[PDB]
């Protein structure tokens with residue numbers, strides 16, 4: 162299907178998605194305005210989460226673009242995510258039901274485990290295979306068309322894929338992925354298991370002071386990204402998004418700015434050569450922008466491997 166990839170459960174995922182997270186200081190009504198502008202610009206995959214405290218505004222934007230005739234529900238791929246205080250398996254279905262009620266949708270296209278780092282329902286120690294069984298029952302019930310995971314490393318994905326009794330493989334692993342942390346080996350593994358890698362912080366993250374070192378290089382000021390932008394008469398952001406599409410990664414892009422939202426859909430309008438991709442692959446430097454004690458101290462931190 163046009164500009165989508167086929168998931169391993171048969172559903173289709175659009176290869177460019179709109180990132181909806183804004184920090185707390187942005188008024189909640191902004192997510193309504195920008196999600197409507199993202200749909201108007203041509204985004205058809207919208208990524209939210211319980212954590213983002215925006216599902217009611219994001220859902221209203223979707224319902225509004227349905228009401229005015231721009232799109233039908235089946236034209237939109239909506240993702241939400243189970244937050245880490247709800248890993249205990251009896252909490253999974255009520256958490257998804259809460260997300261649906263907030264968005265006023267009958268189903269999500271995709272429901273993810275947001276992170277493998279379980280928190281007190283203060284860390285919690287939960288066997289995530291039990292969480293996954295509860296995710297499977299939500300796909301059986303029709304609450305989520307597809308289920309997947311987010312922030313898992315290879316060993317953590319294998320624990321699910323190897324589970325006795327497994328009914329549904331995860332359709333995706335949504336992970337931090339960009340030219341300073343391109344996750345090649347994990348991508349190869351995901352490809353080998355028919356699992357889609359979805360990239361977040363593909364434009365270098367929002368640099369949130371709670372978890373990103375401001376000393377970290379700014380991805381879009383990279384001189385190779387900037388040179389390739391000059392060569393293609395595009396921008397460093399479009400070079401960073403198009404790099405993902407050509408390696409078979411589905412890519413998210415957040416923007417709350419009307420011009421940049423419209424700019425990002427231009428990722429479909431041009432392509433990069435083998436030499437351009439090799440120049441971009443040479444930027445890999447094990448730089449995860451999310452780099453905090455509040456993750457690294459956790460018994461199931463994914464960058465331990």
Ligand SMILES: NC(=O)c1ccc[n+]([C@@H]2O[C@H](COP(=O)([O-])OP(=O)(O)OC[C@H]3O[C@@H](n4cnc5c(N)ncnc54)[C@H](OP(=O)(O)O)[C@@H]3O)[C@@H](O)[C@H]2O)c1
Nearest residue numbers: 180181182208361362363364365366367398414415416417
């Ligand atoms: N699963 C998880 O744990 C997880 C973690 C992080 C993110 N995510 C998801 O991934 C989404 C994207 O990741 P992210 O929030 O880290 O942000 P990102 O997509 O890496 O974007 C980073 C910054 O790039 C700027 N930008 C966007 N388009 C641009 C363009 N064409 N030119 C120049 N700058 C541009 C935006 O600022 P403006 O708004 O000012 O344009 C944005 O704040 C999030 O919204 C969320 O949906 C998930």
